[PDB]
Design a protein around this ligand. Sequence first.
Ligand SMILES: O=C(NCCCCCNC(=O)c1cccc(O)c1O)c1cccc(O)c1O
Ligand SMILES: [Fe+3]
Ligand code: NI
Ligand code: NI
Ligand code: NI
Ligand code: NI
Length: 278
Amino acid sequence: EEITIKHELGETKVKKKPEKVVVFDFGVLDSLDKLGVEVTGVPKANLPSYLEKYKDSKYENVGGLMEPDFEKINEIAPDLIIISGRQANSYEKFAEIAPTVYMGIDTKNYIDSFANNMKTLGKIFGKEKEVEKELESINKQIEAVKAKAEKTSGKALIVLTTGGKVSAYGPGSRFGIIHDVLGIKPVDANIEVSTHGQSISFEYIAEKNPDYLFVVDRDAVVAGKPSAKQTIENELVKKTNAYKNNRIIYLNPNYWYLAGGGLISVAEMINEVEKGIE
Ligand SMILES: O=C(NCCCCCNC(=O)c1cccc(O)c1O)c1cccc(O)c1O
Ligand SMILES: [Fe+3]
Ligand code: NI
Ligand code: NI
Ligand code: NI
Ligand code: NI
């Protein structure tokens, strides 16, 4: 029983319950994990800590997030390839091999895109109720943090560290869920939305003077070398409220940077926010 999927990059006809599934989005991979859905191929080179089981030799290595092994993908001859924003530009290449669905998060409507992505997996795999149950759990999660949020005021800044440099995310960004969904107040509400974040210096941080400084150590997951500490915790940063209040919250980059938009990653993401402000 074939079905047709509409997505940002077009329309794909897909066999229901495809036998061989290749996944280039870790959110999706953690969602299929979460659902008991079996995958064939993953890019093992960038696997998140929490998805380390997909290193097993039962799974085919199809390369890296930025470096798909196209020849290997061909030899697998998958029934479905699922990609996201990091591979958007290779859509045609993938679609040439096998039916390819694109599943990205619209950051203007994080939760709505998330839900539709998940519901599309529900459809493809016959997992509609399991999906709805998980969507419901995250909804209650949100409301709770949404209450805890409104309890207090105090403004938040979201930063990312890569090689001693630091860049910022605000509403509508890849990390906007903090502001947009969970109801934390942004220290700067008009931050130019950018996939690796608006470049800034410490001069900027110790100015907007946030109560909460959410940090994402990019180097921990792209270099394998955590830098987040030393980049951040320096004189000019330490002057802030957040360092004095011990509210510099290092967010887990395995979830936040390599893998969001999945049943597991979004639940975990929300929990790191909750704990961050309790
Ligand atoms: O278009 C993208 N990157 C192209 C430029 C990347 C230049 C090199 N990057 C890395 O080495 C790297 C490796 C693994 C995961 C990443 O996100 C990385 O950026 C991109 C899109 C959505 C999210 C991202 O994050 C991206 O990057
Ligand atoms: Fe990146
Ligand atoms: Ni299941
Ligand atoms: Ni190869
Ligand atoms: Ni081969
Ligand atoms: Ni329902």
